[PDB]
Amino acid sequence: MADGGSERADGRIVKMEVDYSATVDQRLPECEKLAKEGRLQEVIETLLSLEKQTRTASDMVSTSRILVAVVKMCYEAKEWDLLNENIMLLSK
Amino acid sequence: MSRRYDSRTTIFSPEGRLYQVEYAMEAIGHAGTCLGILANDGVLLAAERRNIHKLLDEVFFSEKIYKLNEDMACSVAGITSDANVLTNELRLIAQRYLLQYQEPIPCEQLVTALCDIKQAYTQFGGKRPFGVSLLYIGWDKHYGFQLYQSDPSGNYGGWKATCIGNNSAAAVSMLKQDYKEGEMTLKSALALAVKVLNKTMDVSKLSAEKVEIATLTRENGKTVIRVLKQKEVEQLIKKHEEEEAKAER
Amino acid sequence: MAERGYSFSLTTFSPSGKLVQIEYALAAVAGGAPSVGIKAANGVVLATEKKQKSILYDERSVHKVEPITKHIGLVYSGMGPDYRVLVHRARKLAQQYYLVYQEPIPTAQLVQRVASVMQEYTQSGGVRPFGVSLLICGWNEGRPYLFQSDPSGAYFAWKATAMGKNYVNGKTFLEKRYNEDLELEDAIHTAILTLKESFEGQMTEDNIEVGICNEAGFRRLTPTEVRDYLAAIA
Amino acid sequence: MSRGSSAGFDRHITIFSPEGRLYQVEYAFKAINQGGLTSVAVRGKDCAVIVTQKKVPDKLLDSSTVTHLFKITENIGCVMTGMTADSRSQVQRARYEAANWKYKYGYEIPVDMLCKRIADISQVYTQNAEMRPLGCCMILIGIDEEQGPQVYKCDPAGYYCGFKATAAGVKQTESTSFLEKKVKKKFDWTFEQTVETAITCLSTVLSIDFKPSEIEVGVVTVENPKFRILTEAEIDAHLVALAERD
Amino acid sequence: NQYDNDVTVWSPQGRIHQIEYAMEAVKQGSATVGLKSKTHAVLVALKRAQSELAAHQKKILHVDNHIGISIAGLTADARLLCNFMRQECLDSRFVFDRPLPVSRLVSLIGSKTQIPTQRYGRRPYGVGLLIAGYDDMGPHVFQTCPSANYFDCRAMSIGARSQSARTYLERHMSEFMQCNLDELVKHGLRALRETLPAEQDLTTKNVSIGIVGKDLEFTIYDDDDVSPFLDGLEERPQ
Amino acid sequence: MSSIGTGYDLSASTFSPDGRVFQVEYAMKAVENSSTAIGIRCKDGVVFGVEKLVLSKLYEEGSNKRLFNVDRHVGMAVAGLLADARSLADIAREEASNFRSNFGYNIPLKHLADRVAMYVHAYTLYSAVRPFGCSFMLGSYSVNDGAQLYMIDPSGVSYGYWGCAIGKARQAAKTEIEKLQMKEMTCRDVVKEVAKIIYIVHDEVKDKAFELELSWVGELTKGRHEIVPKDVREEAEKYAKESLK
Amino acid sequence: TQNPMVTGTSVLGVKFDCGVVIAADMLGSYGSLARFRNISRIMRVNDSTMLGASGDYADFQYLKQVLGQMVIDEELFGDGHSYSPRAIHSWLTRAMYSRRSKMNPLWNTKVIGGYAGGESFLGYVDMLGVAYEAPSLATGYGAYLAQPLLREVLEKQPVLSQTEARELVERCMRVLYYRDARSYNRFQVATVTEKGVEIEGPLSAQTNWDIAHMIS
Amino acid sequence: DRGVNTFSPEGRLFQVEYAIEGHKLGSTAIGIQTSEGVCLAVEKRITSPLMEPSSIEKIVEIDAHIGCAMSGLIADAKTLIDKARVETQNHWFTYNETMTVESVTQAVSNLALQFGEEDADPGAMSRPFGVALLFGGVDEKGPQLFHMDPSGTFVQCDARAIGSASEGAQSSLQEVYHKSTTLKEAIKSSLIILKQVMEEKLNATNIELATVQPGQNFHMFTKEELEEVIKDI
Amino acid sequence: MSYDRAITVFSPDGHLFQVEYAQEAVKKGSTAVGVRGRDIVVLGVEKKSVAKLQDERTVRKICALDDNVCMAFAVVASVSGLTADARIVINRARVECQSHRLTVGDPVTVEYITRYIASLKQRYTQSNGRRPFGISALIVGFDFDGTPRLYQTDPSGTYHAWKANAIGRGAKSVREFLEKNYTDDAIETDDLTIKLVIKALLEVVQSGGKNIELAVMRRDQPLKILSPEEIEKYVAEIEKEKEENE
């Protein structure tokens, strides 16, 4: 039925999708270190599935992930294309 | 709110009479005129249509004079809108009385019954009284040939020649002047009818499109009510030229 | 439970042959959609502005050209809801005639009966009369006919009249112009040109809607067809 | 606009203005603006989509009439847009009329006929001030049996006509022109696209966006003519695709 | 003014001004005390007369021999509700044959008196009824207002400065159930004087007594048949 | 909120230029002054709690009531102007009874919530009647559809609820219902939880002492709306005092 | 027998009132005509939580009496006082509606047995479709009247203080005659006991006759 | 219109308070209850010597045993009497006993206040009645005079007078009459106040007197018998 | 009977605005005098407004309510003509008269009509849509006792028996002019009553016996409306006489 707290299509809005986005930024540097050498696309992806959400609110959370990621990606000549694409989706 | 207005429809005014009843007479003044004249062997109605336009198709050839029954005829003086409702009530009353009576419907009887509905609205129901004065022409045995006049005030009148609609004061005198008590026959009367319509209109020039002329003439065993086609009226419009001379002389 | 509110006369006579509140209704039809009607004398053709000026129009049956019955069509100018009731009422009236006569309702008759409700709404308190004027077509008596029924309930008889934006100016241009003895194809071409004169802006085939009445019966012209007529004439 | 001049007792009555405006109707538009509900509707050939926002005051809700998607008949479905109080009364009236149609017609009703019955009834409201018109706005969506998917919109007044794509709510005009560009650009109508194009438009005009849970999409597909609510899952399928779409 | 005569204008508290006037109408009307026991119900009402050459109007009205009512306020408004209460109780007796509970009957009266408060242009009534009844559970005194709001009390007093009468009633609340028919009247008399000035006490001809039960049939005591029930009173308890 | 006492409420058929009638706005204001009445939906029923005003020690259960049984399985908890709340109970009682005659089953609350909300809107429409001046909750336990809780405002909106409260502080009580999970609870635990909220929310400015009266339509009352059983009442009463402290 | 215009029938309803309790026995076999359509059917209804109903005569006419009954309890709850009915008022109000229903061509000899204790008043009522309603010690009408009621009454007249046990063995015996004589059933019964505080009724359980009528 | 729901802050209608002023301009009526009858006095309002007292009355029959004399606005009295007459005759068939003077007064009293500006029906009004009626008749409880007023209240009175000054005409009656007394002294007491409150003075076509004894039918007095009551003013 | 305001609101005068306004409405039905004789009870009316293109029947203030009760109307004012509002009171009065003939078949009583009319006016007050009346009628008719009756009613709801009464153009004024003319001889002589009616009408109207139409009604015979031509013959002698009493 559900009674008390969060609904079944309402009140999933503030916590669920937004929380996931806040947590994955924290996880990110460990995962980025392995990416430069190789296998970037899986590393940016976990965060991206969340990022697919189209709210105003999610963008603000998303400022956090990029900061670390840009350092390795710029360094390399193949990594850089992938971060940039994601950002194109946000705008489009 | 609704309690802070006036319109004095069911409520009597300082006058001792309602605003709504008196105002209806003003609307009738600037709308097309209807007259009924008496002849020795018939009665006739002549009316000015509410159409001042230069082009009519004649979809309905009753836009002022409607023939209710095969024993009766009416005209409209006022707004065509209130007429539409009234026309439908008249086709039923006129035929109902006839089913029972088996005698041509008395001109008086019809009007008093109708006038009762006109007054019913103003007094109660919170509706305004119809903006139409209907000019009834008919024949019954016990008064003879008749013309009766209907008002929104519930006033009736037994007439021999009267006109209601636009510039009525002039019009009734003009019908009296040319036509005395029992003077003029049916054919010569149809001419007289057009002659007053030419003079009195809301907007000048009398044409076939602007006029509709109806005859009650008793034929061989039946009283025949016909609305004349445009073609016949035209022969009367030239007759009306001849009539102007004739009144004077 | 119960409703009162407004039940005293709202309408006061003006010396003009009409009441004040109805006169105002006739301005409403003027700010309404352009609709033109011309009697071709071998059928009647009626044309109306398809749009309500959003210019997304996708008509397949949602028209303002509507067959009431076998040989009666209606196109209007003014109010939408007020019109829908007249269409529903018209079929019931046509059929009322169809039961008795075994022919549907002549132009003159349909007008008398629609006109009585429009006046009803005036005289009565707590109601307002329609904001709709009708271009009514029909084939009766062996002749095509076209009538105008105004929002008052008054009727004016017309072989050609125009409604909508610049209606007043529309009637004088038609009064002078009006034609007869027209082939079916020509009927459409004349009707579209008159519609060009009333209606402003673009015309394509999702901006204007045309219906024709003739001997075969009233039907409503397909959006492809209207386009071919529109192009053809100057 | 006009606020009208009186010559009758026009001020609190719906009766005429020199604009042709009806006072109660114009007041009915302000009722839309009270609710906060705006809808974007798109017609296709695969489906007719109506997508509209779901109101949340608190997270203790049951969704059975929080919902602004209503079943007005099993095949053809609709949304009420505007003030939720006026919406419930109208939905109620309509359903009794809809059921009446069921007794008369005997079957699933065409979209053209369904909008026409509501329109005649709302003519009763519009002419009266005895009972004020209901200041909701209905966009009926559904597949008319031979023609295809149709999107028709009735105003509080009851004005209805067909459109390529329609909008209702706080502001009709601004939403329509945004939608008009989407219509010009005419996309390949299949299930994923028609839903997605509807969803993108409602989000662009607001400039707040949303999650799938925050909107309610109701479709009438050629796949099942039944009127169906997608739910949280199915809408989500479009959203993730939409992100990858440019 | 005219925004206070409109039944469609309200305060920012959400109170219609016409309902507010209608409660006060009771309060200008004469004081009545209505008490219950577990065998009887007593209605004590204060009378009035026009002249010394006149007898006082019963403010106790006869409905049935098991239920009885007492009025405080306007008699003419009273008579419409009275025609309604007699019609419902008699109905109940024919159809159900139960000696109708007080509690069901007052709630329906509450519905009717509420209708003019919602109507535009119609005034609320403004009479107060203390309805005494006896059903098989025992007696109840319910008080119905010029609004829906109805009370189930052991004892109640309504009228001028009625709050003061309640205080005497509250001190003897338990006692009422033990006491006799005779005493219930005497405790009523002692409450009724609190409403009026302390310059004045009751007299024999301004007291009307209406006794209710089904251990007795309904009785109205007028101006001189009042005396047996009257004896035993205390002059102005403060 | 918009409303002025002059203009656009001088008839009960006058529509305001803002889109929401002044009269409906006035009807909500009265609910806002009144005491708090709460009703929380459980997994195994619904538990009501409404505070019953006591102005004298002469009063019994009949005085200042706010629990009605519209059906005999469906309850109604009202808040606001009591006079209109009891009249709408009487018409509603009739409406439920006619339904039971025809339909013949424990009525589903989802149908009631639409028909009643439309009826409450009808009175805003019409001149001969004015809007209802209370917000009320309808609450039932049935086997046909389970536990159901709906609230209707005097506007004539019906929305579905897990747990709602209406009072002097509508928002604070609803956040407090949010914190607790009724998902974890059965109908027995809910009675405790309703009882505290009524005491804290309510601000005395018109009371002097109130009695809490609560009603069950749950497990130990079998799908008919009965007053709270004694065991449940005592469990509920202690916790309410304990929560203050 | 004794049943004008019946189709689906409940055959027999025992009702005997003892001190604070009633036992009513009614068969589960519910013949739709001669054929036993339902082998088990509970013909026990819940008026209220404090009242109970058990009914005999045509079962269709019983569901009608049920809808009427049902609303009356609703009315009492409806006030907000939350009263439970009194056995006499609900049964009595319906006895009047049975006077009206005679005149139209549908017939009723519908017979219900009400035992309640509610408010503070103890009723035993029986209400009919011809509207013979009364307080009683024991009653049964319709088909009950033709065969079990007189033996039940014969014992009841010198001993008016029969108990639920003496009646139990007698109920079992009489229903044995019903399986054999009546053409609307072959046995199997539900035992319902109404009290003035709770409505109790174990489900329909089989019973079977004993033969000894082919010896001579 | 201007408020017809009008309450004062005290808690009575303004409109009812307005209703009395109308009575004051109108006719004068005296009702006195005697052990030996009820006598009813009323103003005929002479203004020509051609108006015939036997042919026209304003003492009118509710029943053949019960009379009512009217005061205040004349139109208003007629509406109350016609409903009351039928109620009375219908009562007679059913019970087979004469209707108590109280029983008829209660029915008419319902009509006095039920007004409201809008939602009016015949049972309601647009403005409260400004007539006070003296219903006098002899029943089985004895001769009774019940008094009904514009406020729609019924009271038992053994003497009431209402007219040009309601309270004034009652204060003269308070000085003279005594509760238990002979028929001639009650008939004398009714005439005596009547001429002093009025502008008009006592004659035998100026006023109308009819007396109802118990054990008698309602009798409207003959020309001669009206003149006999004039000798003792 | 439908409106949305009260028809009247009370005053502290103790007059009804609508009844007084109605009194002027009935003086629209011009001046009418009626005198009672031994065997012929006669009423006559002011203005027939002859132009010999009209009928005489249609303007009448003399109305036959039955064939043995008749009445002529007015009360007070000086305001404009109109038969019609008065005519409406007649139409109610004629049913009222006729319903009594069904009940009592002998020549129906004057008293019944007047009483019904007073109550009829109070009743119209109560209904919000109904327009009240306030008129005076000169009821003429016969009983089953065969004795003459002339009754008159007032807007105050009060009816009185009389030997002569006149109404119109100041009710008290035409009545007082008759009080002078009255002598004891007048009422038994048949001839004398007729002259009274003609002297009263001759005051307010120029050239009567064309504006004096009077009817005599008889014990055994019904209403006879005399031709105007035989009335003019009287007017000429009688006007000689009218100056003499002055």
TrEMBL record, chain A:
Taxonomic superkingdom: Eukaryota
Subunit and interaction comment: Component of the 19S proteasome regulatory particle complex. The 26S proteasome consists of a 20S core particle (CP) and two 19S regulatory subunits (RP). The regulatory particle is made of a lid composed of 9 subunits including PSMD12, a base containing 6 ATPases and few additional components. Interacts with ERCC6.
Family statement: Belongs to the proteasome subunit p55 family.
Function recorded in the entry: Component of the 26S proteasome, a multiprotein complex involved in the ATP-dependent degradation of ubiquitinated proteins. This complex plays a key role in the maintenance of protein homeostasis by removing misfolded or damaged proteins, which could impair cellular functions, and by removing proteins whose functions are no longer required. Therefore, the proteasome participates in numerous cellular processes, including cell cycle progression, apoptosis, or DNA damage repair.
Protein name (database record): 26S proteasome non-ATPase regulatory subunit 12
